[PDB]
Design a protein around this ligand. Structure first.
Ligand SMILES: [Zn+2]
Ligand SMILES: [Zn+2]
Ligand SMILES: [Zn+2]
Ligand SMILES: [Zn+2]
Ligand SMILES: [Zn+2]
Ligand SMILES: [Zn+2]
Ligand SMILES: [Zn+2]
Ligand SMILES: [Zn+2]
Ligand SMILES: [Zn+2]
Length: 429
């Protein structure tokens, strides 16, 4: 814990990655807080009728005392404070760190950047609607006391701008493809993926392209099932949260526990992506692999071991994000189409595809990219972010009720939770 050796520095660094995943009793992006982003979306449905298993998130009804709100807040800020403390301790251990000092700093900053990024996609009105919308307190000092709980919220723009600062120097980060360490520590590719996501949320299509075009060395394997079974990564995998028998999430906190038995999450086959005929083709690899009997999503179904890794960034995302950027750029349509074709062609045979990608333009092209992203990333912690960053309504047409929540509605966002309101007297200043 005192940084007297490299192995002690690295143990604490690995604790940063654990802190954004889950603890022994609660979960963040390795469990329920990743599931939050699918529940906010419109491609799966939550039929649990149980607030303990994210029903209020799905129904766009999260209040100041909901468990998922308190937990996301508490564990994100715990992870952030661990990074702040790590960075301060590392400053006093420069010689012990030796040539690896910069990598350790830049990795720790990536973890803080990721934590803030997820908070910025729950609490504020999106930047695309209002860049001055209040988001969350920007806590950047190592704090062992309650001395500094009082702090105003920074804006959605300010949070993004700080994230960009934490990602500004990445040249000491690793660059390995298809190794445990390359997928489970932040690489330059991982940092650039986050930078791309941030710039897209700000409509900075050119800066997003520059970041995402730096992601090199990955590919799209022909088998779409590789990343959900041993060794839980492939040549497509950029960054994931790994699991081990001794650190899996507790009861009803893992991904697999939400999908495996049909009692919580199902595929929305009435109105979501897999209700659309071009995105439910019987010979699509993703439909064959993942569209289960009784509408179970078959990506994460090992609830016995819970060992499946949580995929944060993979290369199909790089391509579809780049496709979206180029579709928003004057003269970019030909490139957008070629990028879309790479991803769709991996799963859907072009010779018999009802979608003629070469003839898409304007709105039809954008919609094809949005729909491909919906099918490719069903269940992967993304859908509710794409809806929100674009300032779109969350529209969920069910048999007996329709959810329709837009940016002028209070329930578009999560409110600052009671855990914070009790301690922070400046929260509304
Ligand atoms: Zn010395
Ligand atoms: Zn240095
Ligand atoms: Zn900053
Ligand atoms: Zn390396
Ligand atoms: Zn590392
Ligand atoms: Zn069609
Ligand atoms: Zn192919
Ligand atoms: Zn209604
Ligand atoms: Zn509207």
């Amino acid at each position: 814990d005192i940084f007297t050796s490299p192995t002690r520095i690295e143990a604490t660094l690995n604790g940063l990655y654990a802190a954004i995943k889950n603890t022994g009793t609660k979960s963040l992006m390795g469990g329920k807080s990743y599931l939050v982003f699918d529940n906010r979306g419109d491609d799966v449905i939550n039929i649990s009728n149980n607030l303990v298993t994210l029903f209020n998130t799905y129904n766009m009804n999260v209040g100041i005392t909901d468990a998922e709100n308190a937990d996301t807040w508490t564990y994100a800020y715990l992870a952030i404070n661990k990074v702040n403390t790590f960075l301060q301790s590392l400053e006093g251990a420069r010689e012990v760190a030796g040539e690896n000092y910069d990598r350790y700093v830049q990795e720790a900053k990536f973890v803080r950047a990721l934590a803030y990024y997820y908070l910025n996609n729950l609490y504020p009105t999106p930047y695309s609607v209002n860049p001055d919308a209040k988001s969350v307190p920007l806590r950047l000092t190592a704090e062992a006391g309650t001395e500094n709980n009082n702090m105003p919220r920074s804006t959605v723009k300010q949070i993004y701008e700080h994230i960009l600062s934490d990602l500004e120097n990445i040249s000491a980060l690793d660059t390995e493809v298809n190794t445990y360490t390359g997928v489970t520590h932040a690489t330059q590719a991982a940092a650039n993926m986050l930078k791309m996501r941030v710039y897209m949320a700000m409509n900075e299509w050119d800066k997003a392209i520059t970041a995402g075009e730096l992601v090199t060395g990955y590919s799209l394997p022909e088998d779409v099932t590789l990343i959900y079974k041993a060794p839980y990564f492939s040549q497509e995998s950029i960054f994931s949260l790994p699991m081990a028998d001794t650190n899996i999430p507790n009861t009803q906190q893992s991904l697999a526990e939400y999908y495996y038995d049909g009692k919580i999450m199902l595929i929305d086959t009435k109105s979501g992506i897999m209700s659309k005929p071009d995105y439910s083709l019987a010979t699509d690899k993703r439909i064959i692999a993942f569209k289960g009997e009784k509408d179970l999503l078959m990506k994460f179904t090992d609830a016995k071991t819970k060992l499946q890794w949580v995929p944060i960034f993979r290369y199909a995302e790089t391509l579809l994000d780049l496709a979206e950027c180029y579709a928003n750029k004057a003269g970019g349509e030909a490139t957008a189409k070629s990028l879309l074709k790479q991803v769709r062609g991996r799963s859907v045979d072009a010779a018999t595809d009802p979608l003629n990608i070469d003839n898409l333009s304007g709105d039809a092209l954008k919609e094809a990219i949005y729909n491909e992203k919906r099918l490719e990333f069903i269940g992967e912690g993304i859908r509710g972010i794409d809806i929100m960053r674009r300032g779109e309504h969350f529209i969920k047409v069910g048999e007996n009720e329709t959810i329709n929540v837009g940016p002028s509605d209070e329930k578009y966002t999560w409110p600052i939770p009671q855990v914070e309101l009790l301690l922070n007297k400046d929260i509304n200043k």
